[PDB]
Each structure stands twice: as C-alpha cells, then as structure tokens.
C-alpha cells in the first residue's frame, strides 16, 4: 500500500505524472515554431495552415459532428505529444 | 432658405430627469448660457495644470534638485488647461441643455429668447447658408457629439432646425 498505491499510482495520478505530462506537453508546444532562421515564413505558414484546417474542419462538422472529434484529438496529439 | 425639416425627429425626449431645451445647441448658446461656475471650472483647470507640473517637480524632480519648470512649460500648460476647462464648461452647459443636470434658469432664458424671436418674426434657431440637406447632414454629425469630448472636439455652427422640440 504505502509504496505502490500511496507513493506509486496515487502520485502518478498526481504530482509526478502531471509533472512529466506537462514537461512533455510544454516541450512540444514550444518546439513547434522550430526554425529561428526565418521567423516570417514559418508564422506565415501557420496562418495558411490555420485557415485551411479551420475551413476543412467546418466542412467536416457540417457533414457530421462526431467525425470531427478524433480529428481534434489527433491535432492535440500533434501539438502536445 | 425655407428652414423646414426633411426628416422626422423626437419631440420632447428625456435625456434625464429635467426638461429639454435643445438637443443640439449652437456654440453661441452653449457659451452664452454658461454660469459663473463654468468660468470657475475654466480658471480652475487653467491654474491646476501648471501647478500640477510644479507639484510633480516638487515630488520627484527631473534632475537631482528642485527647480521650478521653465516659463515655456508653464505657458503651454496654461493654454492646455484653458482648453480642458472650456471643454468641461461646454459639456456642463450642453448637459444642462439636454436635461441631464438642473436647467431651470436656462429653460426660462430659452423660453424668453424664443418668444422674442417669434415677436421679431425671426426663424427659431436661425437662418443658414446651407441647403436643407446639408443642415440635416450637419445635425447628424453634430448631434450628441459632446459624448466624444475625450477623443475629438465637435461643435454645432450650422443653425439647423433639428433641435428636439415641438414645431413652435
């Protein structure tokens, strides 16, 4: 109990696992705009990708909602994994 | 030349608890209906801004030691303070015209002025150099413009008939 539950799984669903989860998610969030060589082309591509992705997502949700849910889950995976 | 309106306006609208005089008063009227309190506000701002910069120099001085600001800055200060005060005075008188503050004196004065104008066969609110269409555009540009005193100044100079009162 004291070591596998109270200092194991209940710290993993707790201060340790959240810490590791947020370390990885933060690192993935900040290592997204990857190249400091040119800051302009990269963010320009981000405008383009945002507009295109939004348009196609709104198409998909007009077609049917529940299909857009895993698309958003995968987008969060790409952004935060 | 005809001085008759092209569009319908509210009759005796209530901007506050007190009665209405003019919904778009002329500059001349707003300045002639000023009270001594308004001139006091003007002088107050005119004196407060230069005294303000000297007070600031007293609290935290620019250099290490206290030195009264130049007469350059005091002059520009007096001018800007007079401008701020004229703004506040114009706003106070215009709000008395709108019925937002107490306007009994101004009400009786407007009544007497309009009665004298009718006696002299003059048009109420004056005769304009502009066509009726431009009077309308001017009223629509100047009506309730004192709300934007913080941003821009705008004043009525056009002598239009679109003050929100009964026809006579």
């Amino acid at each position: 109990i004291a070591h596998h539950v109270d200092k194991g799984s209940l710290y993993r669903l707790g201060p340790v696992g959240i810490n590791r989860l947020l370390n990885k998610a933060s690192y993935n969030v900040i290592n997204l705009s990857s190249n400091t060589r040119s800051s302009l082309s990269m963010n320009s591509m981000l405008i383009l990708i945002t507009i295109v992705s939004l348009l196609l997502l709104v198409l998909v949700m007009n077609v049917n909602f529940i299909i857009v849910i895993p698309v958003l889950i995968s987008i969060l995976y790409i952004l935060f994994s | 030349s005809s001085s008759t309106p092209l569009v319908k306006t509210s009759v005796n609208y209530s901007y506050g608890d007190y009665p209405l005089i003019d919904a778009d008063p002329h500059f001349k009227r707003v300045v002639g209906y000023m009270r001594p309190s308004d001139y006091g506000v003007i002088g107050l701002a005119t004196a407060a801004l230069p005294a303000g910069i000297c007070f600031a120099e007293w609290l935290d001085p620019v250099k290490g030691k206290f030195a009264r600001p130049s007469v350059k800055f005091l002059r520009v200060a007096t001018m800007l303070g007079f401008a701020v005060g004229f703004g506040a005075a114009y706003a106070r008188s215009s709000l008395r015209f709108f019925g937002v503050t107490e306007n009994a004196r101004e009400y009786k004065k407007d009544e007497a002025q309009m009665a004298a104008r009718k006696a002299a066969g003059l048009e109420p609110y004056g005769t304009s150099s502009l066509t009726p269409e431009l009077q309308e555009i001017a009223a629509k540009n100047s009506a309730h413009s004192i709300a934007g005193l913080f941003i821009f100044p705008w004043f009525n100079f056009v002598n239009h008939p679109y003050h929100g009162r009964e026809q006579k």
């Binding site: 383009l48 295109v52 348009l55 198409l59 007009n62 | 540009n141």
Partner: protein
C-alpha cells in the same frame, strides 16, 4: 466585329495570373516590382472595362506613380540578397500549395452566396450566364460623376473619416522621421 471585344475581362484575368506567377518567379526583385506594375496596369484596364476609369487613373498616379517608385527607390539603395527559385528548395511546397489553392479559391467563391447547401454555394458563383439589361432614365439632371459623389459623401456624410485620415497621414510623416532620422539633441 461585335464580339471581338467580348473576352477582354477573361484576358485580364489570364494576364493577372501570369503576372503574379512572374512576380513569384522573377530572379531579381526589380523584375518582380516591374511585374507588379504590369499587374496594376491590368487592374486599371479591368476597372476601365467595368466602367471606373477614374479609379484606373487614380491607380496609375498613386500606385505606379508613388508606391512602385518608392519600391524601386529602396532596392536601388539597399542590398537585398535573393535566393533563386529552385527545385531543391521550393518543391516541398507543392502539396500544401495545391491543397491551399483549391481550398482557398473554393471558399472564396462559396463565401459570397447565402444558400444553405454547400455545393450549391460554388455553383451559384459560377452562374455567370445571363446578361444585364441597361435601361435609361431621365431623372439625373446634374453632371455628377463618381469623383464628385466621393467628394460629396467624404466631406459631408463621412467627414470624420477624412479628418481621421489626416492623422493617418500625420503618422506617415512623423513615424518615418522618428525611425530614420537621428536627432542630435
């Protein structure tokens, strides 16, 4: 003889596509500026075609006469290195370029119609088949043109935006002096 001048809007559309491609493609950016000038000429043509030659001349005297002049002025005075259009550098863009071309064009043509079903929103945009009847009235007694009316509304109905454009032009003077000049003391 009648329909020799029918496709002069389509020709301008074609030439505009060409000049944009040449802007993107030109080796020296001076040539890109010259092709931008040619695109302004094409737009001015099209504006004459649809009945707005006043705007064509305004464009010629403002865009080509000042803005393009300033572009040439700066590239004559500043070192602006350039990488040439390459297949080892730019071919990676083709998938996203094509996807975005299709999506953006189709959405830009869909956005103008109010129909509920999505496919019909493009099909109405391509529904340019039927001609407009131009009947004549006799009610306009004056010689009011587009510039006269622009002045009328801008100086009476819209005086505020003119007196705000004044401060925009003040910025256009005061900013560049603050950024380019170094004040002694």
């Amino acid at each position: 003889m009648m329909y020799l001048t029918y496709y002069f809007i389509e020709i301008t559309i074609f030439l505009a596509i060409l000049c944009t491609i040449f802007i993107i493609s030109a080796k020296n950016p001076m040539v890109s500026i010259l092709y931008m000038i040619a695109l302004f000429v094409i737009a001015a043509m099209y504006l004459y075609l649809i009945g707005l030659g006043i705007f064509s001349l305004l464009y010629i005297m403002i865009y080509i006469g000042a803005i393009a002049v300033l572009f040439l002025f700066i590239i004559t005075l500043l070192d602006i290195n350039s990488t040439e259009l390459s297949v080892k550098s730019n071919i990676r863009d083709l998938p996203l370029v094509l996807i975005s071309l299709i999506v953006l064009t189709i959405s830009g043509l869909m956005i103008y119609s109010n129909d509920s079903i999505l496919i019909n929103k493009l099909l109405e945009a391509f529904g340019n088949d039927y001609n407009t009847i131009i009947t004549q009235d006799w009610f306009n007694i004056e010689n009011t043109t587009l510039l006269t009316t622009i002045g009328n509304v801008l100086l009476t109905n819209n005086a505020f935006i003119l007196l705000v454009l004044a401060i925009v032009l003040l910025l256009g003077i005061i900013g560049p002096i603050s950024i380019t000049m170094k004040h002694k003391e």
